A paper describes a structure:
The protein tyrosine phosphatase [name], which is a negative regulator of insulin and leptin signaling, is a highly validated target for therapeutic intervention in diabetes and obesity. Previously, we used phage display technology to generate a library of conformation-sensor antibodies that recognize epitopes unique to the reversibly oxidized form of [name] ([name]-OX), which are not displayed in the active, reduced form of the enzyme. We characterized these conformation-sensor antibodies, such as [name], which stabilized the reversibly oxidized, inactive form of [name]. For example, [name] did not bind to the reduced form of [name], nor did it recognize TCPTP (either in the reduced or oxidized form), which displays ~75% sequence identity to [name] in its catalytic domain.
To provide further insights into the molecular details of the interaction between [name] and the reversibly oxidized form of [name], we determined the crystal structure of [name] at 1.6 Å resolution. This single-chain variable fragment (scFv) antibody contains only the variable light (VL) and variable heavy (VH) chains of the antigen-binding fragment (Fab) connected by an 18 amino acid linker. The structure consists of the VH and VL chains, with no electron density observed for the linker region, in accordance with other reported scFv X-ray crystal structures. Within [name], acidic residues dominate the hypervariable complementarity-determining region. Attempts to produce crystals of a purified complex of [name] and [name]-OX were unsuccessful. Therefore, we performed an in silico docking approach using Cluspro software with Antibody Mode option, with svFv45 as a receptor and [name]-OX as a ligand to generate a low-energy structure of the complex. From the model it was clear that acidic residues dominated the complementarity-determining region (CDR) of [name]; Asp89 and Asp93 of [name] formed hydrogen-bonding interactions with basic residues Arg47 and Lys41 of [name]-OX, respectively. By mapping the regional boundaries of the binding interface that were determined by our structural proteomic approach onto this model, we noted strong corroboration between the individual datasets. The acidic residues of [name] in the CDR region, which are critical for interaction with [name]-OX, were found to be lacking in scFv20, suggesting a molecular explanation for the lack of interaction observed between [name]-OX and scFv20. Our analysis demonstrates that a cluster of basic residues unique to [name] over TCPTP were required for interaction with acidic residues in the complementarity-determining regions of those scFv constructs that bound to the oxidized form of the phosphatase.
Author numbering: 2 to 107, 125 to 244
Write the structure that this text describes.
C-alpha cells in the first residue's frame, strides 16, 4: 500500500489522503494515531463506513486501486498520522506506511503480558474484552515497532475456526480465543529482536477480519526482545 508521507492543510480546509494498492479488488480502512505511543482510532472502515462516535467531517471513498480519506473542515485535533489498511490475495491485513497530517496556522480491549524477553523465548499476550458480545466478532493483533508503522500479527474468527498471520510471524505465531472468558491470546515463539514493539488487540466490525475492517483498538502492551 502506498500513501503519501505527509499532507498539510489549514483549519476548515478539505484535505484528502490517498492509499493505492496492487489491484481494485479490496477495500480500505483508516486508522488515526495522534502520537507513536498511543492506541489508534478507526475513523473510516470498509471504504466509507464511519463509526457513530467519529465526527461527520470524516468520509471515505474508493476508486479503482485507490482509497481516499477526506476530512471536510479539518480541525487542529485531527493532526495525526493516518494509516490505511487493506488486504491482498496473500495476506488478510496490510498497511501503508502512514500519512502525517500537519494542520497549519494553529467497547474495551485490555492487553497484558508485555515485558522483556530473550531471543528464542516465547511471548504470551492476553486481551480481556468487555462492553460487547465478544463471541460475535473476529479479533486480532496488530503491532508497531519503535518508529515504524502498523503490521499484521494475527487474526481469528468469532468462533475460532479460522486464523491467519502476518508474513513476519507466520509459522511462529498462534492466536486463540476463549469465548467463555471473553479473551483472545497471542503466542509468539522463537522471539527475535525485530519482534519488539507495541502489540495492540483489535476488533473486527463484524464483516470479517481484514486490514480494512478494524473498528476498535486496545491500549497496547510493550514487548522488548533483547
Amino acid at each position: 500500500l502506498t500513501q503519501p508521507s505527509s499532507v498539510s492543510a489549514n483549519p476548515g480546509g478539505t484535505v484528502k489522503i490517498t492509499c493505492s494498492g496492487s489491484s481494485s479488488a479490496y477495500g480500505y480502512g483508516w486508522y488515526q494515531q495522534k502520537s507513536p505511543g498511543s492506541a489508534p482510532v478507526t475513523v473510516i472502515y470498509n471504504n466509507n463506513k464511519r463509526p457513530s462516535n467519529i465526527p461527520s467531517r470524516f468520509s471515505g471513498s474508493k476508486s479503482g486501486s485507490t482509497g481516499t480519506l477526506t476530512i471536510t473542515g479539518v480541525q487542529a485535533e485531527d493532526e495525526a498520522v493516518y494509516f490505511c489498511g487493506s488486504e491482498d490475495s496473500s495476506t488478510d491485513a496490510i498497511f501503508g506506511a502512514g500519512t502525517t497530517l500537519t494542520v497549519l496556522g494553529q467497547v474495551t480491549l485490555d492487553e497484558s503480558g508485555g515485558g522483556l524477553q530473550a531471543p528464542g523465548g516465547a511471548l504470551s499476550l492476553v486481551c480481556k474484552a468487555s462492553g460487547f458480545t465478544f463471541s460475535s466478532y473476529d479479533m486480532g493483533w496488530i503491532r508497531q515497532a519503535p518508529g515504524k508503522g502498523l503490521e499484521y500479527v494475527a487474526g481469528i474468527t468469532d468462533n475460532g475456526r479460522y486464523a491467519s498471520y502476518g508474513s513476519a510471524v507466520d509459522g511462529r505465531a498462534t492466536i486463540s480465543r476463549d469465548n467463555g472468558q471473553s479473551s483472545v491470546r497471542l503466542q509468539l515463539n522463537n522471539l527475535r529482536a525485530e519482534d519488539t514493539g507495541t502489540y495492540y488487540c483489535a476488533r473486527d466490525d463484524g464483516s470479517g477480519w481484514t486490514g480494512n475492517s478494524i473498528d476498535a483498538w486496545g491500549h497496547g502492551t510493550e514487548v522488548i526482545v533483547s
